[PDB]
Design a protein around this ligand. Structure first.
Ligand SMILES: *[C@@H]1O[C@H](CO)[C@@H](O[C@@H]2O[C@H](CO)[C@@H](O)[C@H](O)[C@H]2NC(C)=O)[C@H](O)[C@H]1NC(C)=O
Ligand SMILES: *[C@@H]1O[C@H](CO)[C@@H](O[C@@H]2O[C@H](CO)[C@@H](O)[C@H](O)[C@H]2NC(C)=O)[C@H](O)[C@H]1NC(C)=O
Ligand SMILES: *[C@@H]1O[C@H](CO)[C@@H](O[C@@H]2O[C@H](CO)[C@@H](O)[C@H](O)[C@H]2NC(C)=O)[C@H](O)[C@H]1NC(C)=O
Ligand SMILES: [Br-]
Ligand SMILES: [Br-]
Ligand SMILES: [Br-]
Ligand SMILES: [Br-]
Ligand SMILES: [Br-]
Ligand SMILES: [Br-]
Ligand SMILES: [Br-]
Ligand SMILES: [Br-]
Ligand SMILES: [Br-]
Ligand SMILES: [Br-]
Ligand SMILES: [Br-]
Ligand SMILES: [Br-]
Ligand SMILES: [Br-]
Ligand SMILES: [Br-]
Ligand SMILES: [Br-]
Ligand SMILES: [Br-]
Ligand SMILES: [Br-]
Ligand SMILES: [Br-]
Lengths: 353, 353, 353
């Protein structure tokens, strides 16, 4: 018999909070205008003191790449050529560097270049903070959570060949886990909310009063992307619009853990499972109501207890840690700005001696 | 008929977590004693090297405001006069600046003032971190959450003219939202827990075993502040004392979203609603039990799905972001201290040459 | 009669989230290799300029503790002797300090030592960040949460002398709290899940389908550590593996507050209680089903409302604040690195003059 309409609604809301987290507005990567501006000033000062010949040549060739008549090749390498290019751009714009464009000892020039090289190191370290790019890692963790690692919606359009509804969503063994469950939120929600082959208009509303109803029977090789579209679009109705924050992610995961973790079935023998086992649950998650099966999605008990499953919980935890790191990036940039400005002030004073 | 005692208790606890967050102990604004002390030392050093005449005059006039016989007007402006005032306070206390009070070149004095001006810039930036004041923004977001933006308890003492219990708390249309719901936690809880005009001792306990019972029938122009006092005072009994943290706020919001989001009514057609629709809910949230109305409070489904309602969820999210920013302020001050101390050390060494 | 199997399962999961938080992987203490390396370079530079005699002696005695023929005792004190030791280790390894090992004025040497002393201060402040050690405070808060402050599993092996199941777990007064409840998660879970003296195979499964069943009747002086082992080992099955984060802790506490806070009993008169009061609850938490007692654990209503109980909630909040502080430590170290590197660069340039 069809499972009852609304019988999986609580489970739907719990997983839908996690889905909605993948749709939430993302943060921006912190940036430091101060570090750029200090770097450009130090570049210009460091070039200015090398003499009219290197200055003229560097400006002449500022659009060129480092790759013998050019005197700039003796003062700069491919490594430091971006410095000269930045410095040439300022000195081809300035009267502000007039003090630097006076005369200095070889030693004075040495000490000045210690400071300009140090400022260039700050800029380099500022750039390394987001190598690799943490916004792209965030996006990838969230996409992985929905579809599986490295997968997209289009890659995950069909269920595997050769399994049954039970083997895929929840075996007779109440600790083993469905073969497609705990890999991706999309497949968990297909098991939880999808049409069972004998459903007749009611079981397709186990999770929600969907319109249109899920129409493709969950079975081997089933093409499920239209039903997934309908299922995932309802998540905002039942879980709203939580913010993309580490706070939200860990709150949603602990709710999921307790919701799946309470044992189910009329003998409390269906472990780490969402949805509603019917009767004892002993048949497994067959999608059918009225006997001992049920429309449910079962996780692997041992992975769940160890914190190694579901795989999307690990991706959601990585997303959370990336959000913490992006917050941290802003403070690390502030620290780098403190070093740059201290150096920039010391260098400013040296224009005298 | 009266709705059943306790029939809204779960909804009451969920909203009461958010109420209790507005009563929680607030954080303090981070402060930097180091930056103040470095600023005062640099102020004193910067004044000391300008000569006995400017020093004497600045100390003479340290209590005056910048607004021709005073020689300090040539060495300072209204902008930098606070520097002289800070410096005069130290030099009118010290033998510690004896080294600075020796003789220096015009150039040495120039370079010293580059460093003292840089330290003054650090102090200025330290002060700008809390302009605008983030504790006041926090307080305002929390107050806005309870009463509506810019409103107080006294401003929100009466329900609007011209509406019914249904129009205010939850219309017949199960997606539209009550006209006073989703504006302020106070009015949500008045709809959820308030007396319906025909209640007889039981419906007034829908949310909680209140003593005294809510006594003012929820209807147009109703004066509800005594009932609000009773309702809000019970929140600690059912939601305890969560800490005011961004973690707590986002955890409370995701719980609310799922709690409101599960569809209600015996045909699952009452969307984004808290409390308990009676029967089908089709009558709307009339506060009455036994038929198809119910004592409930309905949010606007489309705003809820978009994350633009309830309006107090947006204020609570702003409160959370302000708490994150106040944490961040402490680290930004540490960075500013690093710049100040580096400069202060460099300046210390210059007392020699 | 035995309480029903599974009748406390929801309460078990809620408390088990907090238990699992104490078993989660801990963070590491942030460290700064940059600050160590800058400190060692400044130590070596600061020693190098003091002359061949102090250099030779310091290296000679680098393994000794500060405690008259040694010339290093005139250049260093017990306070700064670690500096000399660090500096001697470098100068006994280097040709890198060749520039420093040239000739300098007394003034030049003064100014150099201002910078080396400032770098030593950075290192000292870096070390003070984790004095006291925040990882040990974290560990202690989590252990305190489980067992009570300063207690271990072995210290808490037996229930107190002279009380009854009711007096220990939940008195007749539905606001007073059990005498052993709200002190430690371990004793809360013993009250919630332990065997009542007349249980016959079913009541021992109130919380979970334990194997082996809890076997020791909860009564005065009861030796409960074997039953605690079984009870706590099931927590991973029902609450999974939440990460040890401030986000997780505050999310788990707000869930607990609402779960305990909803009033219970058939007249809604059992306040701030977990588990399932039977009938009215008026008998108290006797562990017995079928009448008006029940297998429950009651907190003190007034402490709960004030946020001063349960005592393990305060410890969990301290754990959360320590985790926030350990995150903050990493950013504070970044700031300290900014000061060190700015100073290190300025000192580098002085090798010229
Ligand atoms: C970095 O130091 C430079 C000085 O080299 C600062 O830029 C001077 O600041 C004064 C402000 O009164 C102006 O008169 C000059 O025109 C500025 N430019 C130059 C090239 O000297 C600069 O403000 C410092 N900070 C940053 C972020 O670059
Ligand atoms: C800022 O630098 C000043 C030096 O200008 C430091 O204050 C000297 O420190 C020594 C400590 O041995 C004392 O003998 C002097 O009396 C101090 N005062 C002065 C005016 O020189 C100060 O510690 C540094 N840090 C801060 C926060 O001001
Ligand atoms: C601190 O400053 C020192 C300089 O005193 C830096 O160490 C020199 O850096 C150059 C790199 O081109 C090498 O040729 C030298 O051998 C380095 N060593 C010394 C002793 O001068 C060092 O990199 C700076 N940073 C830290 C963290 O120490
Ligand atoms: Br149905
Ligand atoms: Br986005
Ligand atoms: Br350069
Ligand atoms: Br790279
Ligand atoms: Br089974
Ligand atoms: Br799994
Ligand atoms: Br009733
Ligand atoms: Br306060
Ligand atoms: Br000044
Ligand atoms: Br301002
Ligand atoms: Br309806
Ligand atoms: Br709304
Ligand atoms: Br039973
Ligand atoms: Br560990
Ligand atoms: Br030294
Ligand atoms: Br210490
Ligand atoms: Br009672
Ligand atoms: Br307590």
């Amino acid at each position: 018999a069809d499972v009852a309409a609304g019988s999986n609604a609580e489970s739907y809301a719990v997983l839908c909070t996690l889905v909605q987290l993948t749709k939430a507005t993302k943060p921006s990567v912190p940036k430091s205008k101060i570090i750029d501006e200090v770097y450009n000033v130090a570049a210009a000062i460091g070039l200015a003191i090398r003499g009219d010949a290197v200055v003229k040549n560097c400006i002449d060739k500022k659009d060129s790449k480092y790759s013998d008549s050019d005197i700039a090749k003796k003062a700069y390498t491919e490594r430091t050529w971006p410095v000269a290019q930045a410095g040439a751009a300022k000195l081809a714009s300035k009267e502000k560097y007039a003090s630097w464009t006076r005369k200095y000892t070889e030693k004075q020039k040495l000490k000045v270049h210690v400071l300009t090289a140090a400022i260039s190191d700050v800029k380099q370290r500022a750039d390394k903070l987001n190598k690799p790019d943490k916004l792209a890692e965030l996006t990838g963790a969230l996409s992985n959570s929905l579809y599986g690692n490295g997968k997209s919606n289009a890659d995950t359009a069909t269920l595997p060949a050769g399994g049954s509804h039970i083997s895929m969503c929840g075996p007779a063994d109440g600790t083993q886990g469905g073969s497609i469950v705990g890999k991706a939120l999309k497949f968990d929600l297909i098991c939880l909310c999808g049409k069972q082959s004998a459903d007749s208009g009611t079981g397709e509303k186990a999770c929600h009063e969907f319109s249109p109803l899920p129409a493709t029977a969950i079975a081997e090789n089933a093409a499920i992307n239209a039903d997934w579209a309908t299922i995932e679009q309802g998540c905002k109705t039942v879980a709203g619009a939580p913010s993309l924050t580490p706070e939200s992610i860990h709150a949603a995961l602990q709710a999921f853990y307790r919701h799946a973790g309470v044992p189910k079935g009329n003998t409390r023998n269906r472990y780490t499972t969402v949805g509603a086992p019917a009767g004892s649950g002993a048949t497994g998650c067959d999608g059918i109501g009225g006997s001992n099966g049920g429309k449910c999605a079962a996780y692997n008990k041992a992975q769940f207890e160890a914190g190694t499953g579901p795989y999307w919980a690990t991706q959601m935890k990585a997303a959370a840690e990336t959000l913490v790191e992006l917050r941290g990036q802003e403070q690390k940039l502030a620290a780098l700005e403190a070093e740059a400005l201290a150096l920039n002030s010391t260098l400013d004073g040296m224009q005298h001696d």
